[PDB]
PDB file of C-alpha atoms and ligand atoms in Angstrom:
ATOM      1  CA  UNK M   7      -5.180   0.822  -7.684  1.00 18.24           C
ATOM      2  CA  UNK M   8      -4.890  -3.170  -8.085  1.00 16.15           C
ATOM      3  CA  UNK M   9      -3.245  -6.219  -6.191  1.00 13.93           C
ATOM      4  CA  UNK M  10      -0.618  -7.595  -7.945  1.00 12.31           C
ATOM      5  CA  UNK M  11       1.150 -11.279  -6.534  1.00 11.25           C
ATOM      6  CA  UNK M  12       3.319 -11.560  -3.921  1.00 12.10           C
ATOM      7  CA  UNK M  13       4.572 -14.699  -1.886  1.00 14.33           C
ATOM      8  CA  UNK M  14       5.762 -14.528   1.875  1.00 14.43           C
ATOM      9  CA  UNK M  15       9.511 -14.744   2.376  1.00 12.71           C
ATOM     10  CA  UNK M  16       9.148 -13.581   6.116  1.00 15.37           C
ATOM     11  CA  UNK M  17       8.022 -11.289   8.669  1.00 15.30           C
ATOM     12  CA  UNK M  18       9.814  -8.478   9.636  1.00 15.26           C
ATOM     13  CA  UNK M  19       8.260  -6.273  12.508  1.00 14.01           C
ATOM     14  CA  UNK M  20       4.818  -4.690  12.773  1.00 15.40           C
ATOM     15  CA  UNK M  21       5.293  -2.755   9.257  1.00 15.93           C
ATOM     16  CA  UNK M  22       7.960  -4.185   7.241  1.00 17.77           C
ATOM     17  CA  UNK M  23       7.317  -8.216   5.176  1.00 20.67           C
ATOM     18  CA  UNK M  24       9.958  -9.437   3.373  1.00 20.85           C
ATOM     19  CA  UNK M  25       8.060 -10.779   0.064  1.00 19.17           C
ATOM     20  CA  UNK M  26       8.987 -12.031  -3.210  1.00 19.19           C
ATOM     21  CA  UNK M  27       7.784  -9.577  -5.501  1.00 22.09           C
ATOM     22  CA  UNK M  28       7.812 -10.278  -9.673  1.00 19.06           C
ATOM     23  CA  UNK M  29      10.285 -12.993  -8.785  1.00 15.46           C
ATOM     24  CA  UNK M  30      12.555 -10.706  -6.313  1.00 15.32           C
ATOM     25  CA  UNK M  31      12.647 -10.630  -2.822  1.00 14.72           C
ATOM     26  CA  UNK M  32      12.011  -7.210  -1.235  1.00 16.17           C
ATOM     27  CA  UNK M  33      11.566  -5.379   1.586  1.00 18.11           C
ATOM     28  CA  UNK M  34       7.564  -3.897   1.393  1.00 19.24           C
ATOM     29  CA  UNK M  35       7.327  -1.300   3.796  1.00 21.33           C
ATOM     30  CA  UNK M  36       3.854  -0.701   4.946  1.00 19.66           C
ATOM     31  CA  UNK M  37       2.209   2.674   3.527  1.00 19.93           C
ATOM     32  CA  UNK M  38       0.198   5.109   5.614  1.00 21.39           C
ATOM     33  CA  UNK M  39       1.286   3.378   9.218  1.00 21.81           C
ATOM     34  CA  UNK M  40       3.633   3.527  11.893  1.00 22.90           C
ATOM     35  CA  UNK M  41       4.124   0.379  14.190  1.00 21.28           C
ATOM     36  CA  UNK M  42       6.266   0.528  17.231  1.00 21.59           C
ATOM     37  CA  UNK M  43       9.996  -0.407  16.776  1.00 18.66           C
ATOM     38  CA  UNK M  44      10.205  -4.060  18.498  1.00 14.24           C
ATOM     39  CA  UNK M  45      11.921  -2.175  21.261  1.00 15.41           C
ATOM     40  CA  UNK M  46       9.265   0.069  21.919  1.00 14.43           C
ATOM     41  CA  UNK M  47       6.077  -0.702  23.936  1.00 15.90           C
ATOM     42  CA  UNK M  48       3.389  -2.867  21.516  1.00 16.59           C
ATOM     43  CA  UNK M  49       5.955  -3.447  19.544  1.00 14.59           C
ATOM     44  CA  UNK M  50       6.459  -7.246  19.853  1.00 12.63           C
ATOM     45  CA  UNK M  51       2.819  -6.570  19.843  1.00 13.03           C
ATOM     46  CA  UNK M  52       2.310  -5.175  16.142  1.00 15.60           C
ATOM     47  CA  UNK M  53       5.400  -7.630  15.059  1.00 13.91           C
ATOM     48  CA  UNK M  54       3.386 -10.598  15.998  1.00 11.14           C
ATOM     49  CA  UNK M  55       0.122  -9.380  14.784  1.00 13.26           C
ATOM     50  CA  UNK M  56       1.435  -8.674  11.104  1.00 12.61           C
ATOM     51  CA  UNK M  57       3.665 -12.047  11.554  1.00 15.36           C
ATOM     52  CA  UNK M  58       0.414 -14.080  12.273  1.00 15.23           C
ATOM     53  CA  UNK M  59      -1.496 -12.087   9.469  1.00 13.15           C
ATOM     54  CA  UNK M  60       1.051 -12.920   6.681  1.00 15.50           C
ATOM     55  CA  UNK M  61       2.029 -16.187   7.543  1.00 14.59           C
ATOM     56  CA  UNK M  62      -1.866 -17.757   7.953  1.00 15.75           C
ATOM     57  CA  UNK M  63      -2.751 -16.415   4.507  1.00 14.58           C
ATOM     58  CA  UNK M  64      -3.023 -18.528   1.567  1.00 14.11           C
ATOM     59  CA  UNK M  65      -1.938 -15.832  -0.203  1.00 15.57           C
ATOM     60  CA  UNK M  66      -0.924 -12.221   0.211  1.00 11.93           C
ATOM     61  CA  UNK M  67      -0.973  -9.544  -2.289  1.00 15.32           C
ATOM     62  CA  UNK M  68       0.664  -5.985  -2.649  1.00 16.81           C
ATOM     63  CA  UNK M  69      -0.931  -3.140  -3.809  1.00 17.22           C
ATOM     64  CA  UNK M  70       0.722   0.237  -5.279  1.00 17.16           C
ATOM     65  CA  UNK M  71      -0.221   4.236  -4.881  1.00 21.90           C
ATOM     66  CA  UNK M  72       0.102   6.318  -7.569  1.00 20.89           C
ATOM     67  CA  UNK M  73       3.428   7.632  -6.464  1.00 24.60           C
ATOM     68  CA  UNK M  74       6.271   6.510  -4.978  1.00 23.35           C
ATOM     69  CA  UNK M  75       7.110   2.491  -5.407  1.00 23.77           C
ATOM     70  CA  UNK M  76       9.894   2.532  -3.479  1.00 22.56           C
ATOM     71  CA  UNK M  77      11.787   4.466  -0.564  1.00 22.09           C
ATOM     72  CA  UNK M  78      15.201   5.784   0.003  1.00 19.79           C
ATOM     73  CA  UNK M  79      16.377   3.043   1.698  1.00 21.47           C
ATOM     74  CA  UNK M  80      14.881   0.673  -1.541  1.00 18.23           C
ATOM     75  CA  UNK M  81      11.989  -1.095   0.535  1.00 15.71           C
ATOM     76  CA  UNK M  82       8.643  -1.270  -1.135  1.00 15.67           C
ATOM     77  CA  UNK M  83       5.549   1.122  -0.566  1.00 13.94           C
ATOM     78  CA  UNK M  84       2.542  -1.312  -0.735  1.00 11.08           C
ATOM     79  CA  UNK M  85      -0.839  -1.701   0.605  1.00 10.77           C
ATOM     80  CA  UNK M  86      -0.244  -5.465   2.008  1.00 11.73           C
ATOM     81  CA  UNK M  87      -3.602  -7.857   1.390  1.00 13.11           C
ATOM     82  CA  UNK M  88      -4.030 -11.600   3.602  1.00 14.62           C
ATOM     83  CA  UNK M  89      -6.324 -13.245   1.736  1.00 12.73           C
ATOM     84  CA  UNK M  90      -8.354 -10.251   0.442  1.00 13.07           C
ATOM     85  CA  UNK M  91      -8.055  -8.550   3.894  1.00 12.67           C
ATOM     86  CA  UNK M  92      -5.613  -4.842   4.752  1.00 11.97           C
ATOM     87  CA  UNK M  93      -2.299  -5.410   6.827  1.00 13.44           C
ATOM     88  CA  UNK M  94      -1.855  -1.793   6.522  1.00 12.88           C
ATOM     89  CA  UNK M  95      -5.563  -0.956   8.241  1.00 13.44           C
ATOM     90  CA  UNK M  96      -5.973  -4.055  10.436  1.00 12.24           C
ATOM     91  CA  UNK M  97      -2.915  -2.999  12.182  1.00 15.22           C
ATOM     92  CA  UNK M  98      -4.913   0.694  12.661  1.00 17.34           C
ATOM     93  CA  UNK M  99      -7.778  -0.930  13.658  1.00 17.16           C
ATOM     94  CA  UNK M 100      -6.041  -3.023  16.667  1.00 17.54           C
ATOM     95  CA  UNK M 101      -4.559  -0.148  17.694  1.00 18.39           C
ATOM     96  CA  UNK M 102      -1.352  -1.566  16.396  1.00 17.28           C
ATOM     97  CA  UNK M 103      -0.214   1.451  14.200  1.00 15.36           C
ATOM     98  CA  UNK M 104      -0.868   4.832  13.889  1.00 15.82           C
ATOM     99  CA  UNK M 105      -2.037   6.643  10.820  1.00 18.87           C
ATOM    100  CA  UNK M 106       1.926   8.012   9.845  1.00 21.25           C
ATOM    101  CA  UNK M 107       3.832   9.141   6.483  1.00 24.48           C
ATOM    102  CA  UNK M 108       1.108  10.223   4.531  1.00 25.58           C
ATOM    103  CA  UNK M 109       2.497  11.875   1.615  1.00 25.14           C
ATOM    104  CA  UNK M 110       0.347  13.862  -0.665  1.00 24.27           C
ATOM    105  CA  UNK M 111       0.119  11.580  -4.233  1.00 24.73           C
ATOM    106  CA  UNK M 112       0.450   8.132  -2.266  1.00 27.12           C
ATOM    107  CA  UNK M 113      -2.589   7.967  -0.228  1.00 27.16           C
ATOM    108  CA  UNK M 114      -5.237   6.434  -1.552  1.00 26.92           C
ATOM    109  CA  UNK M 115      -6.411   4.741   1.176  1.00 26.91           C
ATOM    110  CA  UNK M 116      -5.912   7.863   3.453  1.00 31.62           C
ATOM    111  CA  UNK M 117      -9.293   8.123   4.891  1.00 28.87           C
ATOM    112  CA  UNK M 118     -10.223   4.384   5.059  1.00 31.92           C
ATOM    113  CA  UNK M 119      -7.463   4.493   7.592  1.00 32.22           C
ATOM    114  CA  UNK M 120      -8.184   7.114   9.214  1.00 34.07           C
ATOM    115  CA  UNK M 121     -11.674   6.043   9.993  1.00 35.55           C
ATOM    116  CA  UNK M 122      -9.787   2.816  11.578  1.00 38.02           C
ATOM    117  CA  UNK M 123      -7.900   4.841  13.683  1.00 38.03           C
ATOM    118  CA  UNK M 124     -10.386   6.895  15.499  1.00 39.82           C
ATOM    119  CA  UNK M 125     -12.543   3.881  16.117  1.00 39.69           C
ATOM    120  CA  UNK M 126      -9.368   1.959  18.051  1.00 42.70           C
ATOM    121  CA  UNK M 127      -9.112   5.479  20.029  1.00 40.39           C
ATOM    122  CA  UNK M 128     -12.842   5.069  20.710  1.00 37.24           C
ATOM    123  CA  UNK M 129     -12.440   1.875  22.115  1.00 37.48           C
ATOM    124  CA  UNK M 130      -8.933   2.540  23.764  1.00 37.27           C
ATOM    125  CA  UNK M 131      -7.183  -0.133  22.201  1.00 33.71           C
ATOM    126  CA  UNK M 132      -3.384  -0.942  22.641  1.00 35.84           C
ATOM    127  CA  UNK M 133      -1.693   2.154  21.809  1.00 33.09           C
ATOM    128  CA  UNK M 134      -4.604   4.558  22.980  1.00 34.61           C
ATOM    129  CA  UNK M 135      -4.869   3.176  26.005  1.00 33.82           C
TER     130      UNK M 135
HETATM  131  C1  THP W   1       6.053   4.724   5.160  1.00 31.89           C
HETATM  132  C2  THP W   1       7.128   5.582   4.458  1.00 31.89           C
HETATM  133  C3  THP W   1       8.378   5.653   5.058  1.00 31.89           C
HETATM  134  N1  THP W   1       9.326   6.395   4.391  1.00 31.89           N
HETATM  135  C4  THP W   1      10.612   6.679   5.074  1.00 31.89           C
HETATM  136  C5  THP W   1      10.513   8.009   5.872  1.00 31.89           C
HETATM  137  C6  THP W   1      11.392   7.707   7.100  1.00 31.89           C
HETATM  138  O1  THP W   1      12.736   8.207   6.759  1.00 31.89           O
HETATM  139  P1  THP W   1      13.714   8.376   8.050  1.00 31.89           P
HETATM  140  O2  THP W   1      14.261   6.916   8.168  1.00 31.89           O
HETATM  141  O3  THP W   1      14.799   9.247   7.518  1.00 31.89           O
HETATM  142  O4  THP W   1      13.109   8.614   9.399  1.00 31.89           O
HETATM  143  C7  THP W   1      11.422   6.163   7.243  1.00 31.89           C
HETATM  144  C8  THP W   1      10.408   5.683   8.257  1.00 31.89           C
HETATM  145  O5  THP W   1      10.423   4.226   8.228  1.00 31.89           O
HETATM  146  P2  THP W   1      10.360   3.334   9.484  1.00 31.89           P
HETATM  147  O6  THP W   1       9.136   3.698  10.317  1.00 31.89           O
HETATM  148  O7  THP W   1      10.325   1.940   8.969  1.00 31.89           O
HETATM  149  O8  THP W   1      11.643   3.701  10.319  1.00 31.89           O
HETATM  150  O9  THP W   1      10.954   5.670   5.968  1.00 31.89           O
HETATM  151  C9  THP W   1       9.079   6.973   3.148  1.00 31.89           C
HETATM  152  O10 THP W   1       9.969   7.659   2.561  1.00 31.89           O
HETATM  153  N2  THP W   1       7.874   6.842   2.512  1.00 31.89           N
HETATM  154  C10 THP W   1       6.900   6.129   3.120  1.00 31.89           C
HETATM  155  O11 THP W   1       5.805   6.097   2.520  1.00 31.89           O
HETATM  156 CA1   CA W   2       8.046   1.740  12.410  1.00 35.30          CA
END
């Protein structure tokens, strides 16, 4: 896979960035996660954790699987890079999001995210406690 440019338009909640993307704003849709709604608990959690990410980068990046760009509803499928660093597997590591939506042919990153999500169990963080 490789980054390609992106520039922050705005933060969303914990898994959706509005960026512009080859000159268009879109919706990028986190792959491989599942944050709480805003109205759920951690929640307002994730949103501000992805919000902080994203808006202290100098720059963020997006990042394509092999498969589907784009969902039904027309939001991007990206991995989502803050100056060099994951959205997609800080969020696991904080116990922020749950490993979710992993389709067979879009998920590269599978088990790098996976390995992020046991060690938040381990240490009972947010979610898993
Ligand atoms: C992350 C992801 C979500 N989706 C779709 C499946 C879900 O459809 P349904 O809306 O019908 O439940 C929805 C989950 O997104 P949200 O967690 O943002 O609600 O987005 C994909 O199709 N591919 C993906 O890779
Ligand atoms: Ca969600």
């Amino acid at each position: 896979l490789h980054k390609e440019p992106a520039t922050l338009i705005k933060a969303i909640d914990g898994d959706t960035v509005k960026a512009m993307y080859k000159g268009q704003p879109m919706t990028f849709r986190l792959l491989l996660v599942d944050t709480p709604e805003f109205n759920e608990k951690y929640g307002p959690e994730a949103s501000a954790f992805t919000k902080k990410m994203v808006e202290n980068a100098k720059k963020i990046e997006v990042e394509f699987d092999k498969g589907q760009r784009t969902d039904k509803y027309g939001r991007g499928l990206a991995y989502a890079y803050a100056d060099g660093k994951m959205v997609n597997e800080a969020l696991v590591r904080q116990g922020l999001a749950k490993v979710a939506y992993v389709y067979k042919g879009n998920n590269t990153h599978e088990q790098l995210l996976r390995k992020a999500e046991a060690q938040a169990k381990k240490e009972k963080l947010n979610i898993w406690s």
